[PDB]
Design a protein around this ligand. Structure first.
Ligand SMILES: CC(=O)N[C@@H]1[C@@H](O)[C@@H](O)[C@@H](CO)O[C@H]1O
Ligand SMILES: *[C@@H]1O[C@H](CO)[C@@H](O)[C@H](O)[C@H]1NC(C)=O
Ligand SMILES: *[C@@H]1O[C@H](CO)[C@@H](O)[C@H](O)[C@H]1NC(C)=O
Ligand SMILES: *[C@@H]1O[C@H](CO)[C@@H](O)[C@H](O)[C@H]1NC(C)=O
Ligand SMILES: *[C@@H]1O[C@H](CO)[C@@H](O)[C@H](O)[C@H]1NC(C)=O
Ligand SMILES: *[C@@H]1O[C@H](CO)[C@H](O)[C@H](O)[C@H]1NC(C)=O
Ligand SMILES: *[C@@H]1O[C@H](CO)[C@H](O)[C@H](O)[C@H]1NC(C)=O
Ligand SMILES: *[C@@H]1O[C@H](CO)[C@H](O)[C@H](O)[C@H]1NC(C)=O
Ligand SMILES: *[C@@H]1O[C@H](CO)[C@H](O)[C@H](O)[C@H]1NC(C)=O
Ligand SMILES: *[C@@H]1O[C@H](CO)[C@H](O)[C@H](O)[C@H]1NC(C)=O
Ligand SMILES: [Ca+2]
Ligand SMILES: [Ca+2]
Ligand SMILES: [Ca+2]
Ligand SMILES: [Ca+2]
Ligand SMILES: [Ca+2]
Ligand SMILES: [Ca+2]
Ligand SMILES: [Ca+2]
Ligand SMILES: [Ca+2]
Ligand SMILES: [Ca+2]
Lengths: 416, 106, 166, 83, 115
């Protein structure tokens, strides 16, 4: 049909009597001639109990831009994106795993499955290619480097941390804690400094967003039901007008002249203007347990910093490179390691940070970096989603669980 | 149970014919008569039934002031919970909720 | 026979290729086979977690799927290697799908749209122009089929317990 | 020393505004937070008059009365009473 | 700077008896007393002059004499986290790294550059 990617039948009278139309595969979009395809720049992402999926910003079109992410069971909460590889990162609480996946559905990989309890926010730094997440069970903020899969925990002893956003150009990290007294906190990328930038008149600061056209910070509060925005020092502060039915906001993002918001009580996505509020538009309704909203933008992830310069890569740091304010870099080492006089380089620290075993005593270590109770080892079902636990069981080397049932001739075990 | 609930469970609507809604005291009824909804949803900021009757007849904030179960901040004219006044933490912009007039907890 | 404790939910065929296609929501998979029972293959497994019904287009060699985890109507190649989503807007409980490639019409049913109404609906095979074909005296429409010589649509309802034609 | 009310300290004082008011960075002055603008109402021999506190606007509430010596108002029912 | 003694917990420093003196830079340096004592976070040179501490051991002569660059300082000084370090035991700002200029004692500032 002269189409670049896909040709689909229409009514015989449609398209001037040609009877066909052209469509582009996931991750692609249609161009002015309605025949050729171009790669998507802008689309919105949102997460919910059942699914993580993305939709276009033009409300005239309401068909998904990416292959939806869904599994059995599912409870998605935290999401971020990587544009240079057409990838999204998502966290699942029903499995306590963080995954990376491609918007065409062709790839799925596990970032980590180890020592995640209540992860309910992900942030991604694209100059250094670092991933940050918040956990409310361990009450901590953790950072990982994806090339080496190197892990360090940089903030601890928080009360109820919820949301984290990272700014690579400014070298700042922002965090929110909603245990009374609630606070919004600023840190450096390595977590070396930490200070509350907002602690007055905050009840439930559930969500944070960054505005890049102005270098400003936005937060939404569910106790007082308000949207506020400030400058990154917290010293200039303004409040947007009353949103019509917003009564328990949770998630926030900012794109061009608009601010996008999610409400639990409505189970809805709302769009208003970031300067004033108002002009309420409802993008979706009836979403079962809607959690987070995030904006995919390839242009946002353009940039350079001292960690990314081609003539001296990774800031000469061996493991971690962190941007910090006033356009300069810092180096870090993973958990089992220490820094050397030339801070570029790392060494091993068995004194202060010895090695640790994967899962402790009363659990089975699964090959994907996950821990499950010993009773589950051969109960007949894949309690570890790599199917590690049910591997080579019923054989003479591994007898089966008392909860399971065993097949007499076969020596294979099935749930009771 | 199907004889009158709200759904036409058979073709001609023999069920739901001639009913009068009689929901219990734990619920609220809406002005045009179409729906009854639990009490928690009355006066919650969300229009839970058509014609907005669940939110129409609701208390409002007096002009420039706060409810008797609230506290007001001198520096910003904003309302916070009564408990927040004098609990060691400055909630107001100027921290006026932690004034010198309060007494300790042993 | 459904492997690995699965079931067969929806079935559709292609005649000039000797193929039969079916859906499994317990395995979350879509399968194709030759009508002689040989040459059996799996063609979609990435996000079809609760399929119900299939339709096939024999003029353009396309396969249409109804999905309910995320309410979707999707279009693929018989091999599974190209994919599009056509209808997403108001689907609450899509259950039935039927096609006429000669005229270029798509018919589908929903027993609980997000707007609240049960619906039987007509569309263009690309999803462009949409029309409500039945809304009066309609309960739980579960299946649609077409008569192509007389150009009639037949559908079945399980709440009001009838089989009816337009 | 303070607009509205103030409270004693063993070596100093502090200033506070009543409900419905905001305290400016002066630390000693109060401003009113209602969107409603105040106005003045006064009664002449034959008339009741309406005036703005900035002196910009003058108006008549009622005319042709005999000798209006006293006024008062009621907020609850939005009423005006006179002798 | 002048005289050292092995006191408890470490070394102690004393200045010559020949005049009026003052102790600076963790009392490890000796200065000749005329007042004019300097502010916090600075570094001082024996000619009685004060500079921003970052210039310390930067391989540049900040003062009328090289007190800022002496081994007595740079054997114990450590480079800040946001800096770059060379085998010389010297610290340079990172943007100088691979700038086509030396800025260290060795070629290390420009060593290994991918151009
Ligand atoms: C003895 C003393 O501290 N008196 C102070 C006075 O100087 C002034 O500052 C005032 C301000 O309200 O407070 C009181
Ligand atoms: C609240 O934030 C201000 C910001 O300057 C800070 O000075 C103060 O210590 C903070 N209060 C608490 C209890 O952390
Ligand atoms: C409503 O319920 C009350 C209490 O059972 C009963 O007395 C009354 O007759 C009922 N009215 C109708 C119309 O059902
Ligand atoms: C999905 O199908 C492809 C193609 O046959 C196969 O390689 C892959 O293993 C399948 N994935 C799962 C999870 O079954
Ligand atoms: C005039 O104001 C009174 C105030 O109590 C009100 O009751 C009445 O309805 C008003 N009438 C008109 C015509 O506005
Ligand atoms: C060991 O435990 C520490 C502290 O919890 C870290 O989680 C570390 O990641 C663990 N082990 C390994 C193999 O890194
Ligand atoms: C077989 O091993 C399982 C653990 O997988 C249980 O411990 C079970 O009690 C064992 N049973 C026998 C008979 O050894
Ligand atoms: C709310 O109640 C107050 C009295 O406390 C006033 O009557 C006001 O007019 C009411 N309505 C609004 C919108 O504030
Ligand atoms: C401690 O609290 C008790 C509560 O009954 C009393 O208020 C007591 O006066 C307090 N102690 C002091 C030292 O004031
Ligand atoms: C030198 O390094 C030590 C750690 O070995 C301390 O961090 C000290 O603060 C550093 N001093 C400077 C000036 O960088
Ligand atoms: Ca609320
Ligand atoms: Ca198991
Ligand atoms: Ca189990
Ligand atoms: Ca009924
Ligand atoms: Ca309500
Ligand atoms: Ca307080
Ligand atoms: Ca006094
Ligand atoms: Ca120097
Ligand atoms: Ca150089």
């Amino acid at each position: 049909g002269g189409c670049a990617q896909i040709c689909v039948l229409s009514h015989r009278t449609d398209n001037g009597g040609l009877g066909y139309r052209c469509k582009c595969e996931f991750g692609f979009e249609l161009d002015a001639d309605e025949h050729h395809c171009v790669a998507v720049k802008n689309f919105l992402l949102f997460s919910s109990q059942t699914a993580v999926r993305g939709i276009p910003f033009t409300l005239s079109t309401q068909e998904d831009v990416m292959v939806p992410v869904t599994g059995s069971p599912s409870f998605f909460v935290g999401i971020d994106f990587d544009a240079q590889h057409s990838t999204i990162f998502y966290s699942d609480l029903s499995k306590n795993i963080i995954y990376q996946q491609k918007i065409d559905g062709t790839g799925k990989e596990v970032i980590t499955a180890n020592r995640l309890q209540n992860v309910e926010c992900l942030s991604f730094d694209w100059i250094s290619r670092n991933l940050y997440w918040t956990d409310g069970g361990s009450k901590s903020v953790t950072v990982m480097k994806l090339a080496d899969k190197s892990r360090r925990q940089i903030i601890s002893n928080l009360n109820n941390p919820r949301s984290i956003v990272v700014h690579p150009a400014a070298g700042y990290m922002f965090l929110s804690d909603w245990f009374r007294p609630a606070k919004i906190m600023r840190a450096w990328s390595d977590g070396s400094h930490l200070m509350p930038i907002v602690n007055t008149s905050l009840g439930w600061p559930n969500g944070l967003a960054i505005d890049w056209s102005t270098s400003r910070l936005y937060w939404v509060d569910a106790f007082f039901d308000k949207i506020e925005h400030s400058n990154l020092d917290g010293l200039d502060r303004k409040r947007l007008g009353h949103v019509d039915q917003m009564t328990h906001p949770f998630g926030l993002t900012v794109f061009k002249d608009n601010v996008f918001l999610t409400d639990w009580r409505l189970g809805a996505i709302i769009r208003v203007r970031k300067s004033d509020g108002g002009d309420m538009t409802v993008v979706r309704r009836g979403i079962s347990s809607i959690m987070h909203v995030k904006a995919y933008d390839a242009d946002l992830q353009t940039g350079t910093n001292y960690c990314s310069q081609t003539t001296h890569p990774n800031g000469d740091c061996s493991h971690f490179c962190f941007p910090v304010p006033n356009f300069q870099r810092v180096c870090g080492c993973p958990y089992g390691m220490k820094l050397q006089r030339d801070q570029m380089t790392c060494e091993g620290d068995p004194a202060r940070e010895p090695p640790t075993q994967q899962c402790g005593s009363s659990s089975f270590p699964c090959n994907n970096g996950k821990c499950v109770p010993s009773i589950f080892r051969c109960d007949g079902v894949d309690d570890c989603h790599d199917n590690s636990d049910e591997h080579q069981c019923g054989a003479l080397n591994n007898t089966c669980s008392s909860s399971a049932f065993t097949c007499v001739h076969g020596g294979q075990c099935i749930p009771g | 149970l199907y004889v009158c609930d709200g759904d036409k469970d058979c073709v001609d609507g023999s069920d739901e014919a001639g009913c009068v809604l009689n929901c219990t005291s734990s619920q609220f009824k809406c002005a045009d008569g179409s729906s009854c909804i639990n009490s928690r949803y009355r006066c919650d900021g969300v229009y839970d039934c058509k014609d907005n009757s669940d939110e129409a007849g609701c208390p409002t904030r007096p002009p420039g002031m706060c409810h008797p179960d609230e506290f007001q901040c001198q520096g910003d004219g904003t309302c916070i919970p009564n408990t927040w006044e004098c609990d060691g933490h400055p909630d107001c912009i100027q921290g006026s909720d932690e004034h010198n007039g309060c007494v300790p907890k042993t | 026979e459904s492997k690995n404790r699965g079931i067969v939910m929806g079935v559709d065929f292609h005649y000039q290729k000797h193929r039969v296609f079916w859906t499994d929501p317990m395995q979350a998979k879509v399968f194709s086979t030759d009508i002689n029972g040989l040459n059996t293959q799996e063609i979609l497994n990435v996000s079809i977690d609760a399929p119900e019904n299939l339709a096939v287009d024999w003029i353009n060699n396309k396969l249409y799927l109804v999905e309910t985890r995320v309410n979707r109507i999707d279009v693929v190649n018989l091999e599974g290697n190209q994919r599009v989503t056509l209808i997403t807007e108001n689907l609450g409980h899509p259950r039935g799908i039927a096609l006429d490639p000669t005229v270029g019409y798509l018919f589908f049913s929903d027993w609980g749209s997000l707007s609240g109404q049960p619906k039987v609906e007509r569309a263009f095979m690309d999803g462009s122009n949409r029309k409500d074909l039945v809304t009066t005296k309609l309960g739980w429409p579960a299946g649609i089929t077409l008569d192509l010589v007389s150009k009639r649509v037949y559908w079945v309802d399980s709440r009001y317990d009838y089989i009816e034609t337009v | 020393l303070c607009s509205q009310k103030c409270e004693n300290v063993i070596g100093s004082y502090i200033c506070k505004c009543a409900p419905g008011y905001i305290r400016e960075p002066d630390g000693k002055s109060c401003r009113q937070n209602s969107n409603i603008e105040p106005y003045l109402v006064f009664s002449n021999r034959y008339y009741i008059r309406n005036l703005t506190i900035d002196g910009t606007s003058y108006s008549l509430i009622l005319q042709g009365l005999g000798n209006v010596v006293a006024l008062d108002f009621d907020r609850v029912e939005e009423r005006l009473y006179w002798i | 700077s002048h005289i050292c003694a092995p006191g408890p917990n470490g070394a102690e420093c004393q200045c010559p008896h020949e005049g009026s003196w003052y102790l600076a830079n963790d009392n490890k340096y000796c200065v000749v007393d005329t007042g004019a004592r300097c502010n916090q976070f600075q570094f001082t040179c024996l000619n009685g002059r004060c500079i921003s501490q970052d210039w310390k051991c930067d391989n540049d002569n900040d003062c009328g004499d090289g007190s800022d660059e002496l081994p007595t300082v740079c054997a114990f000084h450590t480079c800040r986290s946001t800096a770059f370090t060379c085998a010389n035991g010297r610290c340079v700002p990172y943007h100088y790294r691979c700038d086509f200029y030396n800025d260290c004692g060795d070629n290390s500032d420009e060593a290994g550059c991918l151009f």
